[PDB]
Design an enzyme around this catalytic site. Structure first.
Site, short mmCIF file in Angstrom:
data_model
loop_
_atom_site.label_atom_id
_atom_site.label_comp_id
_atom_site.label_asym_id
_atom_site.label_seq_id
_atom_site.Cartn_x
_atom_site.Cartn_y
_atom_site.Cartn_z
CG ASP A 143 29.71 7.94 97.23
OD1 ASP A 143 30.96 8.09 97.20
OD2 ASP A 143 28.98 8.03 96.21
CE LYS A 177 32.53 11.13 96.15
NZ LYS A 177 33.27 10.64 94.98
CG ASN A 212 28.78 12.75 96.80
OD1 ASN A 212 28.75 13.25 95.69
ND2 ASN A 212 29.11 11.48 97.01
N1 LIG Z 1 19.18 18.24 94.96
C1 LIG Z 1 20.03 18.87 94.13
N2 LIG Z 1 20.00 20.20 94.04
C2 LIG Z 1 20.86 20.85 93.23
N3 LIG Z 1 21.77 20.22 92.47
C3 LIG Z 1 21.92 18.88 92.45
C4 LIG Z 1 21.01 18.12 93.32
N4 LIG Z 1 21.34 16.83 93.16
C5 LIG Z 1 22.37 16.77 92.26
N5 LIG Z 1 22.71 18.00 91.82
C6 LIG Z 1 23.77 18.31 90.84
O1 LIG Z 1 23.98 17.30 89.82
C7 LIG Z 1 25.24 16.62 89.98
C8 LIG Z 1 25.08 15.11 89.80
O2 LIG Z 1 24.21 14.55 90.81
P1 LIG Z 1 24.43 13.16 91.59
O3 LIG Z 1 25.52 13.17 92.57
O4 LIG Z 1 23.07 12.81 92.12
O5 LIG Z 1 24.84 12.24 90.34
P2 LIG Z 1 25.34 10.72 90.21
O6 LIG Z 1 25.26 10.49 88.71
O7 LIG Z 1 24.55 9.87 91.15
O8 LIG Z 1 26.86 10.80 90.66
P3 LIG Z 1 27.92 9.57 90.85
O9 LIG Z 1 28.16 8.99 89.51
O10 LIG Z 1 29.09 10.34 91.43
O11 LIG Z 1 27.23 8.67 91.85
C9 LIG Z 1 25.63 16.99 91.40
O12 LIG Z 1 27.00 17.09 91.64
C10 LIG Z 1 25.05 18.35 91.64
O13 LIG Z 1 25.90 19.37 91.14
#
Ligand SMILES: Nc1ncnc2c1ncn2[C@@H]1O[C@H](COP(=O)(O)OP(=O)(O)OP(=O)(O)O)[C@@H](O)[C@H]1O
Ligand SMILES: [Cl-]
Ligand SMILES: [Mg+2]
Length: 493
Positions: A285, A287, A290
């Protein structure tokens, strides 16, 4: 600053309470005195106040200093080290070393001089000095800290104060550890939503991986707990948010990065990739969306829910996961694959940092997924003149459709990929230690509201308790050191 009520529960216990712990712990040298920050500090105080081990401590420290100092300074530092510790008539001379190592260390140079000498010094330190350390007041004090590290530190200890972002299962918050003042990000997963959508497996894989890997290029897990409605991961705060925001949304007229900046982020993503691949993990994943950015201008990779850990004597896997336009030909074709797919997505990512568009579609073009898949399988990529000869070549070597020909991870490492001319001005050694100044530092830039939306079985309950494993040791020890609490409580009389 911090909460006085929660600060007052950080206090060292009387030794009687630390009895049991002896059995539960690894009391091996490498694991206690080298890999755990508080263990290393205490071991080093013992060596410092028992002066017969003085010669071994300063050679140890001078090797680490040499390893991370920059090119122009190294030749002189090598000469100093030789004279101090390796001439027979010198004051800090290390008799314990064997005649061979002594001899071999006094000659020549290279990109890794004194790595055999460092092994010889650690080998010695793990015998008599270590044995005596366990009989001393400093080892006892290690047990006091490991006890405090184990006490319960759940939901009540964190204050949420702003929303950083939104994922598939809930929000991510900026939060504070109440006792020390340290700032983290807390990612929340709604339990009922995880169940109905069958997301347990993806959530557990992310948490397992972020707990066990320890790299400056991947977000680190510090705590894992549950509340009545959510599972929570408390992790490194990355205040700049994603690299893609910075490509498109800041300078609208002139999007994209200058080349030195693009190279620097590329080099940091390769190191993180390497730390995953050395443990037989495939990311799946990668990109721009991320890859996250911090206050100092360094980056790390995130979102590990699509990852797969290869089992014992398995070298490839199958499965159709990812984001269209980032998935390599072998995957699209239904073949078995290994790390190859990560190095293709690295190609697409560098391309977009330089050009401000993808290699298989014009900027703001609209293409149904079926058409985008045909393009990846068959289209030659073209390169406008924002690219130099070096960055064109590097991209061609990653976007190569035959994985047998593509550059990547082989014979244990990315060292072949590291020699590409693209990286000619990068000091790999200094990057890996966190000691290059990034050539961009985040200037002035620091969420619309939406509303929110079955009893559980023991299968669900037991899964939640297993996920909520508590405090990770290495990150906790760092927090205590960074914020000054180690300094205030590590006192004798
Ligand atoms: N360590 C961090 N520090 C600051 N912001 C964060 C952090 N982790 C995530 N975020 C914010 O929250 C958003 C969502 O996080 P993340 O990518 O972990 O979600 P996800 O639900 O796993 O996404 P997907 O459905 O695409 O897998 C991120 O795009 C980012 O803007
Ligand atoms: Cl730039
Ligand atoms: Mg995810």
């Amino acid at each position: 600053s911090r909460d006085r009520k929660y600060l007052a529960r950080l206090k060292l216990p009387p030794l009687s309470k630390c009895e049991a712990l002896r059995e539960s712990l690894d009391l091996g040298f490498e694991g206690m005195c080298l890999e755990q920050p508080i263990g290393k500090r205490l071991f080093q105080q013992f060596l410092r106040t028992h002066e017969q081990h003085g010669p071994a401590l300063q050679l140890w420290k001078d090797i680490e200093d040499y390893d991370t100092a920059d090119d122009a300074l190294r030749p002189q530092k090598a000469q100093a080290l030789r004279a101090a510790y390796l001439e027979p008539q010198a004051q800090l001379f290390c008799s314990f070393l064997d005649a061979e190592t002594v001899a071999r260390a006094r000659a020549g140079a290279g990109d890794g001089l004194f790595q055999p000498l460092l092994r010889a010094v650690l080998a010695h330190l793990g015998q008599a000095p270590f044995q005596e350390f366990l009989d001393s007041k400093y080892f006892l004090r290690f047990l006091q800290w490991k006890w405090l590290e184990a006490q319960p530190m759940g939901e009540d200890w964190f204050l949420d104060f702003r929303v950083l972002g939104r994922g598939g299962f809930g929000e991510v918050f900026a939060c504070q550890m109440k006792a020390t003042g340290k700032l983290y990000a807390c990612k929340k997963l709604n339990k009922k939503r995880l169940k109905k959508r069958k997301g347990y497996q993806g959530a557990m894989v992310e948490k397992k991986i972020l707990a066990k890997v320890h790299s400056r290029f991947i977000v680190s897990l510090a705590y894992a707990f549950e509340t009545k409605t959510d599972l929570c991961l408390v992790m490194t705060i990355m205040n700049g948010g994603d690299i893609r925001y910075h490509i498109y949304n800041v300078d609208e007229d002139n999007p994209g990065f200058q080349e030195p900046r693009a190279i620097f982020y590329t080099a940091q993503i390769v190191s993180g990739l390497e730390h995953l691949h050395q443990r037989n993990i495939i990311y799946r994943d990668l990109k721009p969306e991320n890859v996250l950015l911090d206050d100092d201008g360094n980056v790390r990779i995130s979102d590990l829910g699509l990852a797969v850990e290869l089992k014992a004597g398995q070298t490839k896997t199958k499965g159709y996961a990812g984001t269209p336009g980032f998935m390599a030909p072998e995957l699209l074709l239904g073949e078995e694959y290994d790390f190859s797919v990560d190095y293709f997505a690295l190609g697409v990512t560098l391309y977009e940092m330089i050009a401000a568009r993808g290699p298989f579609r014009a900027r703001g073009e609209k293409v149904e997924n079926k058409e985008l898949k045909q393009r990846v399988l068959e289209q030659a990529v073209t390169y406008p003149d924002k690219f130099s000869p070096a960055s064109k070549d590097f991209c061609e070597a990653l976007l190569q459709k035959d994985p047998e020909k593509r550059l990547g991870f082989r014979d244990g490492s990315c060292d072949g990929l590291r020699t590409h001319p693209l990286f000619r001005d990068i000091s790999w050694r200094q990057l890996e230690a966190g000691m290059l100044t990034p050539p961009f530092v985040p200037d002035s830039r620091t969420i619309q509201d939406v509303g929110a939306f079955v009893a559980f079985e023991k299968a669900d309950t037991e899964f939640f308790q297993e996920f909520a494993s508590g405090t990770c040791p290495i990150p906790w020890q760092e927090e205590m050191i960074e914020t000054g609490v180690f300094g205030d409580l590590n006192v004798w009389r």
